[PDB]
């Protein structure tokens, strides 16, 4: 869903992502440290929310376009250089642009990037 969802005072869901409001970044819903950080009931609410599975990003060679409504309001951004492709979207550097982007760390220690489509 698009609508913002309460999990705890520290944790919010927006645009398919769970956001750590204290660190101002998304966190993988399957991050092992949510066992400490959230109670059972709160983790159970997250399972009922159909969030983006971060494992699906593993293959992606390009940064990730999101038709987001609110996510970028809560997350620290950096500016990164990308190729602007003829598909009008961003592609990794081997026409360039700088984009405000949200870095995310994956299971295997790869860095991906969410940007606002």
User: Could you tell me if 63 and 82 are in contact, meaning their C-beta atoms sit under 8 angstroms apart?
Assistant: yes
Quick check: 37 and 10 in contact, CB under 8 A? yes
Angle at 72 between CA 83 and CA 52, to 5 degrees: 85
Phi and psi angles of residue 74, each rounded to the nearest 5 degrees, phi first = -110, -10
Residue 91, token pair as written in the block = 């592609």
Q: What is the DSSP letter of 10?
A: S
Listing from the earlier edge strand, what are the strands of the sheet with 5-6? 5-6, 11-14, 17-20, 25-27
Question: Parallel, antiparallel, or unpaired for β 64-66 and 111-116?
Answer: parallel
Count of domains forming the chain? 1
Give me the domain span that covers residue 46.
1-117
Give the whole-angstrom CA distance, residue 67 versus residue 33. 28
Structure obtained using: X-ray
Q: Do 101 and 114 form a contact (C-beta atoms < 8 A)?
A: yes
């Amino acid at each position: 869903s698009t609508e913002e969802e309460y999990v705890s005072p520290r944790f919010l869901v927006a645009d398919g992502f769970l956001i750590d409001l204290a660190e101002e970044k998304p966190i993988n819903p399957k991050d092992p440290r949510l066992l400490t950080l959230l109670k059972d009931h709160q983790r159970a609410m997250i399972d009922q929310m159909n969030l983006v599975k971060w494992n699906d990003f593993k293959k992606y060679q390009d940064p990730i376009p999101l038709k987001a409504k609110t996510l970028f309001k809560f997350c620290k951004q950096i500016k990164k250089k990308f190729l602007r492709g003829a598909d009008f979207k961003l592609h990794t550097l081997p026409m360039t642009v700088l984009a405000s982007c949200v870095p995310i760390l994956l299971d295997d220690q790869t860095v991906q990037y969410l940007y606002d489509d």
